[PDB]
Each structure stands twice: as C-alpha cells, then as structure tokens.
Amino acid sequence: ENSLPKVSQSVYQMLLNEMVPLAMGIERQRLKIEEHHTVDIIRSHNLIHELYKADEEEKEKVLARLRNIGFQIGLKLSELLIFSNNPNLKFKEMDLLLIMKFICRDVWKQIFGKQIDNLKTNHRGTFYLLDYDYRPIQSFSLEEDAKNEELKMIEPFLEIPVGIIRGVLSSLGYSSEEVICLASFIDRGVSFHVQ
Amino acid sequence: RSLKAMGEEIWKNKTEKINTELFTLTYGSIVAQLCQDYERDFNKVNDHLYSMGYNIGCRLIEDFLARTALPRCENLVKTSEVLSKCAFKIFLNITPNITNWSHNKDTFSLILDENPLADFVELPMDAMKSLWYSNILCGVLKGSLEMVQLDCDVWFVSDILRGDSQTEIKVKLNRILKDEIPIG
Amino acid sequence: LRPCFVSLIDESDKPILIYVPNEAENEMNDVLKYNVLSNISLDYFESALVEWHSLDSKPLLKSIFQLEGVSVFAMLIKQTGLKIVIGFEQKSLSGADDEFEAINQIFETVRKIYIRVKCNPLLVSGDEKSIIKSLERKFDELFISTEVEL
Amino acid sequence: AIETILVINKSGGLIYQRNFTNDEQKLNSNEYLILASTLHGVFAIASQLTPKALNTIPYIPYVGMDDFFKEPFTNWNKSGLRQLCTDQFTMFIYQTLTGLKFVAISSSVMNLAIQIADNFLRKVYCLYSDYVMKDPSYSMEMPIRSNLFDEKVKKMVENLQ
Amino acid sequence: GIYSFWIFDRHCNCIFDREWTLASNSASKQNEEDAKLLYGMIFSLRSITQKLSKGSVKNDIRSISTGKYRVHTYCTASGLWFVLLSDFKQQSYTQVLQYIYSHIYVKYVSNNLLSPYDFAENENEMRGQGTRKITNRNFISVLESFLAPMV
C-alpha cells in the first residue's frame, strides 16, 4: 500500500553491529579528539569484542544490557508497524502466543529482511523460530586458524534479538523466558526458543 | 550537474529501505540506554556517543567510496558540498545546506533541513541543557574524514530541541598531511 | 511414528536418561512403568539363547520385542559402549518393513543427535545437569512439534 | 596524439625536451630532469620483479608519410618498462642496445597501440643518429641545440596525426 | 594469465599471503622483499603522473605496461592500492578491481568487527618490517573462488 519513508539498511545494520562495543565501552568507563572541549584516549573496536570472550571477563552483568536495549525497541514498534503500513492483519488484540508467529513474520522481515523460519511448537506451550543465514553475522569473518575458537566470540551478538521478541510479549504483557542456541544447517545457523 | 543527480541514481542503484521512524526509535533507545545506565550525566554521554560515531564512521567511509567511485578531494570547497549532499543522501535521505561560508575558507557551518535522528523527539528538563543529541554525527564525520587524510574537526552546535533554534555544525579544516617514509 | 519413551544407557549399565515425552501436559505415572520396562530390557541384554547380533559392519536394527502394551527393541552400535533403546506403543502399530527400516533410520537420527551433543564444546563439562535438559530440548522436536511447520 | 617527446642518455639524465602541441606550460627544465632521473630509477628495478618465476618482434605499418626500412624488425627491450597509461595521458619508452631511452608521452590514447608508437620511435632514433650525431657542436651526452633537429622532429609530429 | 594479487594500504605494506592464483606457477612466503620493490616502482610513478595534471583533477594510474607481462593497479581515494599482474591477454581490470573492492573487500573486511583496519601493531613500525594481517576463513577462500576462473 503506502510506501513513503525510506532510509538505508546498511548504516542501520552497522549500528546493529555496534551496540555491543558501545556497551563494553560503557562498562569500561591519547586520541585527543574533541580538543575544543576535551580529549579521548582511544577506542579499539577490534579489541573490545576481543575483550569479552577473548579475555573472559565478567560479561554476565553486561549481557543484561544487551538484553535491556531490545526491550524498548520490542515494546514500541507494534504501534509503529501500523504506521509502517496498514495491511489489515495489523491488529494486536486477538491472539496470545499465536500471532507471535505472525508479528515475527513481519518485523523479522523489517529488521532482518528474510522470512525463512521453519517454526516448531510443542503442544502450543513453547514456540521456537530458527533461520539458517543470520543477517548480521553471516557477513562476518574469522582468523582462519580454526572455526570453533571464533564461535566463542560471536555469542554476545546473539543476545540482541533476545530483547526484541521479549519486548513484544512484554508489550502484550508477559514474564515468560527465552534461550538461544546456534544451529548448523546442511544445505546452502541459529535458533530461538521462547515459552 | 552530475553530482546533483548521483544521489538519485544511487537511490535507484541501492535497494536498501528501512522506514525512517524505525531508525529514530533505535537511536532514541540507545541514547536512553546511555541515559539510564550512566547516572543522568548528559555531559558524559556526548563523549561516548562520539566514540560510537568515531569507531563506526571509520568503517563507514570505505563503503561510501565503494558505492561512490570518487577521487580524493584536496580543498575544503568541494568536499564540503559533496559531504553536504552525496555522502549523506546515499545514506540519510536528506540534503543539508552549507551556509555562513567563511572568507578565509577554513571554516563553515551547515544547516540541515530535517534529521532522522531527531524526527519526533522530546527531551526532559533534566536533559534540556548540557547535551548535544547527534554527537554520533560528529563522530562519523571526524572519523570519516581522518581516513581521507585531512584532520578536520566538526562539532554540532545547536539542536532543534536545545534552544529550539536551528541545526548547525561548526566545521574547521586543519592540515592536509599525507603519509610518508616509504624507505622506512 | 511416535516413540513412547527414549532411553539412554552407557557401557557401565548406568542409564543416562530414561526420557518420556509428554509426562507434563498429559498422563503421568506410566513413566514408572517406562523406566522399569527399560530395566527389564537392561537385564534382558542377552537371555535364553536369543542372539540379536550377527552383522559387525554397521549395527542395524536388532530384535523387536513386545511386552504389556509396548514394542521395544535394541540398537547396540558397540561403538564407545552406547546401549540406547526405543520402544513404541503397540496401539498405533502397522508392522511393515519400511516401518521397520524407518525406525532403524530414526534410531540413527537419535544416534546422530547424541553424538552431536556429545562433543559440543560451547559449554564444557556439561556432564551432569542441563546437558540432559539440552539433549531433551533436542529430542522433543524430531518426533513431535511438527504441527505448525506448514 | 603525441604532444611531448624526450630523449634520455645512458647515464641517467635528460637530453632533450619539447612540449610540442600542448601550448600551456607549468613545467620548467629541472622538474623534467627529476622525471628523467626517476624513470631511470624505475627502469633500474623494473626488470627484476621476474613474476613468471622462470621470438617477439615489432612490425611495419609505414608511419610517417618514404620510410627507412620496410621490415618487421627486432627490439632489444626484452625485460623492462615499455608503456604506461593513466586517465589524462599515456607514455612510451624505447631503449637502444647502446643505452639511450626514447620517451614519448601522448595525451590521448593511440597489441597495435604499443607497436605504432614503437614504429614512430625507431624513426626518431634514426633521425637522432643522423642529425645531431653528425654535429661538431655536439659534445657528448649534452643537450641538443640543433634547430635542424627540432623542426625535423616537429614535422614528424604532424606526420603522425 | 594472472600471476599475482597483492593488497597495498597507505602505510606501504603488502598484505598478500602465500602466493597462489598462479603466483606459485602450478595452478594454470619468500617475496617479502618483493613487496618493497613493487611499492617503489608504483609510488615513484605515482608522483610522475601527479606532477602532470590537467583540468582541476588528479590522475589515477591504470597500468604500467612493462615488457613480457603487465601490472594493473587500482589506487583508491582511501590510499588502498589493489594491484594485479596480468599476462597481456585481457585489457585493464578497472571494474574487476571495483568488484573486489565493493563486494569482496568491504563486505568481508571492515565489516567484520573481529578484525581491524590492519593499520599498525599499536606501535610505530607501520612503515616497514611488520607482519601482515589478512587471514580470514571466508575472505581468502572466496577470493580464490573468484580468481580461479582467471588463471
């Protein structure tokens, strides 16, 4: 239908990469940059992500700050989805844990583009969604000596869509939990699991 | 004018669309994360929002040159206008205008029409002083420009909320030193 | 097409997990029958001259049994001493050979799931608690929860 | 297409320069000598890259309407710089067996493209070695002050384009 | 025929690894000295065409076309110099080098946040005698995927 406002996916996507060394720099707080007013020391983004899992600090307090930031995103976009477009499926108050399949059929296409899911739910008690090529970190690289050492590193990046889909259920009002695995498809991987 | 039309051609070349209001909430959310995490120190979030901007703009500028095969500018006067239209317009669908163009050609200012960091934003009276909202824009401009071998400093001086006046960034050129000692 | 339990025993005759699907949300206390069926098959490893194994190349689907409402068997790979067994409810049982090789191949799928979760070093020293919950969390979608995929 | 011709002596120094048809200048003499010394320094190292890690002849199109020798000849320059191309000009190099390097720089673009600008440059090396080689004012490895040389190569710029 | 690919930054460093895509001459490091003398041939000839400039613009170098091979360069405006040594069968790769900048480089280097700008080792020997940086599982593999059509 209506298609008025547009901004790039790219600068968006690097911002979605860049909430995590932001949070590491929050916890850890010379290139004298703003020398009209002040000075900075440095900010090693290549070593900030090589300080959480490549040095094994107390990131467990910091992981809540990755969890926290998606909630206020996840609370306040359901109303913004009907200002995104108005496709008449947009109403919210008919279903409880059975339009989370379909609110993550759209906002997961509107912050991640694709819709390859293969959803599975045990007796409509717990619903889980998985995809084979996650849009941030399947553009990401390695140090080529192994691969399993690199899957230590990427574990804080998975926690940003914790807060999103937990935000929408708390937008409907909930206290049901959520945990993230990392799958491995066999054809040319990460899974999600909510109660 | 070709560099007029480059932004519209790239806006038909690239196909990447987010709705603009979704970008604003993901900027208001992260500055709210700094606001509630740190101890309401609006001074002390401009610096680290700038640190965000520096360390994301110095990875931003080479994909900007990837889409826009442009030569390295050497004066102020052409990079000011191409930063005022193309390097924003392929990313942020805006065209900020250069005004107050100084006679010594070392400084200027930049009115921007609208911004998608500050579309529908209200700040509280605690936040109403001692804070500039788009210090990530200071970061991305300064950390962008020190890749291309000119250590300009820009600093954003007036919100459309702070003072409710106008949106300006005071800019100052500095040296144009290139790299050296290939002998080692 | 649906197992009635899933049982796992290592080489020291210690049961790793006698998993039963749907003991919450549905009928309880038949799990008390299920684990003692597993122990009947555990001391019924080889008894009264009945031999299950003759092929040493790949351990295929071995001898079917049927006892008091279920249909159990065994699949001893003989690799790292794994002794895992699966029963089926005799109520919904068609008794064909593509059924027989079908439960042979899904026995090898649950073999694959155990050998995948056996060497996941994303969490190390996962040997006593929530390794069990994690492998149950990988069990409970391969035979059920297909209801919403379409 | 060619607008400036240099010649280089074998000891790494400029000999002659004429900015023929460009007719707006910013370069005086010793910056052209800086170019001559740096192309001699480049042509020093521009053989031993040996990127292989391990008979080619030029040809006869009759450039310059007779010619001197109507035959596909050889060339001594089996390893080194031959030509360059940029977005505002292109440049050419021809060496002798003795050691003279024979620059030609062309503003437009003019395989075959090396070969026409090789076939030009055997002619001027013939014309160098008949019109200022036989000259008693010409002491050795000095500049060229024969005006008789200079219009007779100025005629051959318009005998090219 | 393509002999060798190399990657050249602003700080006069090569970041090309074990030689292949026919840089081993067997798919039709010892060359760390060769990185310097390739740089000296280009940078000196960068200054030649810089000193002859017409019409309010600088000049990029397309190709030094030597004897018995070629060399094709692509100097960026960021000081990145993608250099490729052909065998004079095809013409200048001034869009193949744009493909391996806009697609295989910037989407696989400098978007990956576990690898830096490869600038310096927190130290002031960027201008020489530094061990290289580019070792990726994906990038080296997808480069070799792209260039095995050529050689």
Side-chain angles (χ1 to χ4, degrees), chain A residues 5-28 54 58-140 146 148-187 189-195, chain B, chain C, chain D residues 1-54 56-64 66-109 111-161, chain E residues 1-24 27 29-151:
Chain A
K6 162 168 177 181
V7 66
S8 161
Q9 191 260 14
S10 48
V11 287
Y12 212 79
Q13 198 267 324
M14 50 213 77
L15 189 150
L16 305 164
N17 296 115
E18 183 65 26
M19 282 75 75
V20 63
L22 173 72
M24 192 36 88
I26 292 167
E27 198 261 0
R28 298 261 65 85
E58 199 269 319
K59 67 180 178 64
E60 293 89 2
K61 182 253 298 178
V62 177
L63 287 202
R65 274 69 175 173
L66 309 162
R67 280 181 291 257
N68 178 41
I69 181 57
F71 263 109
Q72 316 95 24
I73 309 165
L75 278 148
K76 305 176 261 303
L77 73 173
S78 55
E79 57 273 65
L80 271 300
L81 212 65
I82 75 169
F83 322 121
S84 308
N85 207 355
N86 290 274
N88 316 328
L89 294 99
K90 51 173 177 285
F91 189 71
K92 269 89 197 175
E93 296 87 327
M94 73 291 290
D95 279 327
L96 278 297
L97 280 74
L98 72 164
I99 51 165
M100 58 68 56
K101 62 176 71 67
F102 295 140
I103 197 67
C104 303
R105 209 185 35 88
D106 308 312
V107 310
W108 196 77
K109 270 201 299 288
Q110 284 330 103
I111 78 167
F112 293 128
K114 64 182 204 266
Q115 188 64 40
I116 188 166
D117 289 85
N118 297 115
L119 162 64
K120 284 153 204 280
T121 179
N122 288 114
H123 267 304
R124 288 90 194 174
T126 63
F127 300 21
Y128 37 62
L129 230 39
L130 71 207
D131 64 317
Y132 315 114
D133 74 334
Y134 181 47
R135 187 53 184 267
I137 69 167
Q138 209 71 11
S139 72
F140 209 85
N148 62 6
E149 61 183 359
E150 274 92 2
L151 275 297
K152 183 156 74 84
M153 295 299 103
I154 321 294
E155 308 286 318
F157 293 95
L158 282 72
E159 214 187 15
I160 294 94
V162 173
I164 305 298
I165 59 172
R166 278 203 210 173
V168 192
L169 306 182
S170 52
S171 87
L172 275 296
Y174 267 103
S175 163
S176 302
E177 58 93 9
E178 160 67 75
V179 76
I180 317 297
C181 182
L182 194 143
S184 310
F185 200 38
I186 69 166
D187 314 307
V190 56
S191 66
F192 294 131
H193 169 51
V194 72
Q195 267 57 40
Chain B
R1 182 53 255 162
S2 82
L3 194 151
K4 196 69 159 86
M6 294 298 103
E8 290 83 2
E9 298 150 39
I10 289 157
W11 219 246
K12 305 305 150 286
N13 281 133
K14 74 173 272 313
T15 67
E16 292 323 289
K17 174 183 185 299
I18 318 293
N19 51 318
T20 61
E21 57 268 56
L22 184 59
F23 195 11
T24 60
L25 59 93
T26 59
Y27 182 75
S29 64
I30 59 172
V31 303
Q33 172 52 58
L34 276 296
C35 182
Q36 63 84 30
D37 198 286
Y38 280 167
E39 314 97 306
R40 308 302 311 278
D41 42 356
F42 302 103
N43 297 317
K44 294 162 160 289
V45 295
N46 280 122
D47 61 358
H48 193 273
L49 180 71
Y50 179 85
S51 175
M52 190 146 197
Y54 176 77
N55 262 7
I56 195 66
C58 54
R59 280 159 190 252
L60 183 50
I61 202 66
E62 54 271 60
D63 58 84
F64 158 69
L65 278 71
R67 210 157 283 105
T68 73
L70 312 175
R72 202 254 311 273
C73 180
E74 72 276 353
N75 48 70
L76 198 59
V77 74
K78 183 264 289 181
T79 182
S80 55
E81 64 89 20
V82 75
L83 191 39
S84 83
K85 61 175 313 298
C86 288
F88 276 174
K89 207 256 178 190
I90 74 163
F91 288 136
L92 296 175
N93 217 11
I94 57 179
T95 174
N97 313 119
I98 182 168
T99 61
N100 315 104
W101 173 242
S102 165
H103 59 101
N104 52 3
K105 315 294 180 185
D106 165 76
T107 50
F108 56 96
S109 301
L110 176 85
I111 178 61
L112 56 92
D113 313 336
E114 75 281 343
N115 45 359
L117 288 196
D119 273 324
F120 293 147
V121 174
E122 288 83 10
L123 294 163
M125 271 74 68
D126 188 21
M128 206 48 248
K129 307 302 290 150
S130 83
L131 172 56
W132 304 109
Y133 196 49
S134 308
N135 223 35
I136 186 162
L137 291 200
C138 289
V140 301
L141 291 168
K142 287 192 55 172
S144 72
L145 283 161
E146 58 89 16
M147 293 297 103
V148 294
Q149 305 319 291
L150 59 92
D151 48 359
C152 177
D153 54 332
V154 311
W155 57 101
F156 161 75
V157 302
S158 82
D159 281 279
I160 209 62
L161 280 79
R162 303 275 331 279
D164 288 323
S165 47
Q166 208 65 256
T167 61
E168 291 102 330
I169 298 103
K170 276 287 299 285
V171 180
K172 188 195 69 168
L173 195 44
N174 296 271
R175 53 91 177 171
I176 322 296
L177 178 63
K178 84 176 302 164
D179 270 314
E180 64 180 2
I181 188 50
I183 308 179
Chain C
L1 205 56
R2 281 140 308 274
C4 57
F5 63 97
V6 176
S7 164
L8 317 167
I9 302 101
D10 67 84
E11 81 283 338
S12 82
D13 291 331
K14 187 47 87 172
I16 317 162
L17 172 59
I18 317 295
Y19 160 69
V20 178
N22 215 6
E23 69 276 50
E25 214 166 7
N26 275 110
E27 180 59 46
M28 60 295 299
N29 70 67
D30 174 38
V31 58
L32 301 169
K33 282 99 184 183
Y34 275 131
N35 43 22
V36 299
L37 293 174
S38 80
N39 288 280
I40 283 296
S41 185
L42 267 172
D43 49 29
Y44 183 76
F45 157 77
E46 160 76 42
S47 65
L49 291 75
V50 180
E51 178 50 73
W52 72 98
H53 198 101
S54 312
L55 169 74
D56 312 339
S57 301
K58 189 257 168 202
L60 72 164
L61 188 67
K62 319 288 190 332
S63 309
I64 187 66
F65 323 103
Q66 205 278 336
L67 284 87
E68 54 272 7
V70 302
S71 46
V72 301
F73 44 84
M75 192 75 34
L76 325 157
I77 261 333
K78 160 261 344 146
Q79 288 101 21
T80 189
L82 203 73
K83 282 83 176 177
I84 45 174
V85 288
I86 282 294
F88 292 100
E89 178 45 59
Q90 202 266 346
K91 194 7 267 176
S92 261
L93 210 63
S94 76
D97 204 4
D98 69 338
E99 173 177 357
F100 182 76
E101 281 322 290
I103 64 176
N104 174 62
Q105 50 84 17
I106 70 168
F107 212 98
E108 273 302 312
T109 68
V110 68
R111 206 261 172 278
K112 182 252 166 183
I113 290 311
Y114 180 60
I115 205 60
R116 183 176 176 87
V117 76
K118 183 54 152 289
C119 48
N120 259 324
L122 187 48
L123 289 180
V124 188
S125 175
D127 47 354
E128 88 289 15
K129 282 310 309 313
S130 181
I131 176 64
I132 312 296
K133 188 265 181 182
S134 81
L135 63 89
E136 196 268 331
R137 184 46 200 109
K138 302 308 175 293
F139 281 8
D140 50 354
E141 71 272 27
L142 62 84
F143 42 81
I144 51 179
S145 74
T146 51
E147 52 200 32
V148 72
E149 296 176 353
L150 58 93
Chain D
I2 300 180
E3 78 192 340
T4 302
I5 293 91
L6 318 168
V7 294
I8 310 299
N9 75 96
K10 58 186 85 76
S11 291
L14 187 148
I15 295 304
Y16 162 62
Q17 172 257 322
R18 184 82 46 215
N19 54 5
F20 270 108
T21 316
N22 45 357
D23 56 70
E24 292 83 4
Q25 208 43 67
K26 41 163 192 309
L27 277 300
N28 62 93
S29 86
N30 46 9
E31 302 97 28
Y32 262 108
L33 199 150
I34 285 151
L35 281 71
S37 46
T38 46
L39 276 72
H40 190 51
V42 162
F43 207 76
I45 67 168
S47 86
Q48 56 265 52
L49 279 155
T50 186
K52 187 184 287 185
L54 173 61
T56 80
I57 57 161
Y59 317 109
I60 185 65
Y62 172 68
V63 193
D66 272 343
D67 68 314
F68 310 144
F69 182 75
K70 308 172 287 293
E71 198 270 337
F73 41 86
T74 180
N75 61 319
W76 307 267
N77 48 355
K78 62 181 177 64
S79 63
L81 189 154
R82 309 280 95 79
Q83 91 183 26
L84 187 150
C85 46
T86 52
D87 296 330
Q88 302 149 2
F89 60 94
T90 176
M91 183 278 288
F92 302 97
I93 281 299
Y94 173 32
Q95 55 152 339
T96 75
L97 187 43
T98 62
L100 299 146
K101 315 295 179 300
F102 264 81
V103 191
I105 175 171
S106 160
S107 86
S108 181
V109 187
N111 40 50
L112 63 93
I114 189 167
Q115 302 304 117
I116 171 162
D118 189 358
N119 271 112
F120 191 81
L121 267 291
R122 190 273 303 276
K123 305 285 173 279
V124 60
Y125 161 67
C126 288
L127 208 69
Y128 161 86
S129 189
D130 213 32
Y131 271 65
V132 74
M133 191 56 48
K134 323 195 152 70
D135 198 345
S137 312
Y138 182 68
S139 51
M140 294 299 291
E141 280 100 0
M142 294 298 103
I144 303 307
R145 282 167 225 279
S146 178
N147 72 322
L148 189 69
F149 195 36
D150 282 342
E151 60 256 2
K152 285 289 280 292
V153 66
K154 194 251 186 176
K155 189 50 70 184
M156 211 187 201
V157 162
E158 280 96 6
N159 215 350
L160 172 69
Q161 73 183 4
Chain E
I2 308 301
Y3 285 163
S4 310
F5 188 38
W6 321 79
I7 308 100
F8 275 104
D9 68 322
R10 317 170 279 107
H11 305 147
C12 54
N13 304 115
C14 182
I15 310 94
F16 174 64
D17 200 75
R18 211 223 149 299
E19 56 271 304
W20 215 264
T21 63
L22 271 182
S24 63
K29 57 180 183 176
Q30 277 75 242
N31 54 6
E32 47 264 14
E33 48 85 20
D34 201 1
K36 294 290 176 161
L37 65 94
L38 192 43
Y39 199 92
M41 186 293 266
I42 297 169
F43 166 65
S44 64
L45 272 166
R46 164 153 203 84
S47 58
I48 300 302
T49 176
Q50 272 307 111
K51 281 189 232 200
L52 275 297
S53 315
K54 291 158 55 72
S56 83
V57 73
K58 289 175 183 57
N59 204 348
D60 186 74
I61 296 91
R62 289 177 80 182
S63 68
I64 297 102
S65 305
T66 187
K68 76 186 177 181
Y69 55 113
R70 304 177 67 91
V71 62
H72 306 261
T73 67
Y74 176 61
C75 301
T76 58
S78 167
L80 273 300
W81 303 355
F82 279 126
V83 298
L84 201 53
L85 282 73
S86 171
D87 281 333
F88 197 40
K89 56 96 179 178
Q90 203 175 353
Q91 300 326 106
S92 85
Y93 303 142
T94 190
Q95 81 284 331
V96 193
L97 293 156
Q98 295 331 286
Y99 184 71
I100 59 174
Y101 179 59
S102 84
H103 290 82
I104 198 164
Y105 174 67
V106 75
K107 215 183 72 178
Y108 279 74
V109 176
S110 81
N111 277 334
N112 50 1
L113 301 197
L114 62 83
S115 45
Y117 298 113
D118 310 328
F119 279 168
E121 294 293 328
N122 209 339
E123 192 271 333
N124 294 335
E125 282 286 338
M126 71 294 307
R127 256 93 172 171
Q129 293 82 18
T131 300
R132 306 173 285 104
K133 265 77 58 184
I134 286 285
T135 44
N136 303 328
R137 156 184 85 85
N138 50 9
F139 169 67
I140 305 299
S141 83
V142 72
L143 183 70
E144 283 272 345
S145 85
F146 186 47
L147 301 183
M150 311 285 207
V151 299

